[PDB]
């Protein structure tokens, strides 16, 4: 699949922000401050190479990787983890770090980011701007 993920996406809605952030051990102060922030996240894709600028609550996280190659991803807790991002199907980026299964799916202008920890499904829905 050679689908382009490039764009700026405005967060529309999210489910289980607080349950997820609590499950990852984010300090309560940051959870309360960040829970209602609906920012813009950016993806810059060049072939297999990706640069993500994610607005997640009160944190901005920058991650860069090439699909299929070992990368070091920065987590919400500030911890850096070694992992690999893969292309799944026609429109998905999939990775697994610190017992989280992450799925980034693009459907036209709608991006769905799903982070599954135990049976908590943290889902973010963003729209291209």
Ligand X SMILES: Cc1sc(NC(=O)C2=C(C(=O)O)CCC2)c(-c2nc(C(F)(F)F)no2)c1C1CC1
Residues that bind ligand X (CB under 6 A): 9, 11, 41, 43, 52, 54, 56, 61, 63, 73, 75-76, 85, 93, 95, 102, 104, 111, 113, 124, 126
Q: Give the shortest CB-119-to-ligand X separation in angstroms.
A: 18
Q: Give the shortest CB-14-to-ligand X separation in angstroms.
A: 8
Return the half-sphere exposure (C-beta side, CA atoms, 13 A cut-off) of residue 88: 13
Q: Give the shortest CB-108-to-ligand X separation in angstroms.
A: 14
What Rg do the C-alpha atoms of the chain give, in angstroms?
Answer: 14
Residue position matching structure tokens 């997820």: 20
Distance CA 9, CA 29 (A): 26
């Amino acid at each position: 699949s050679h689908m382009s993920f490039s764009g700026k996406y405005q967060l529309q809605s999210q489910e289980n922000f607080e349950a997820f952030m609590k499950a990852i051990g984010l300090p309560e102060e940051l959870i309360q401050k960040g829970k209602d922030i609906k920012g813009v996240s950016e993806i810059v894709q060049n072939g297999k190479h990706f640069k993500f600028t994610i607005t997640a609550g009160s944190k901005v996280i920058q991650n860069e990787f090439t699909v299929g190659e070992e990368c070091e991803l920065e987590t919400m807790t500030g911890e850096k983890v070694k992992t690999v991002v893969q292309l799944e199907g026609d429109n998905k980026l999939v990775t697994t770090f610190k017992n989280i299964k992450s799925v980034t799916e693009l459907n036209g202008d709608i991006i769905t980011n799903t982070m599954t920890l135990g049976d908590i499904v943290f889902k973010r829905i963003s729209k291209r701007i």
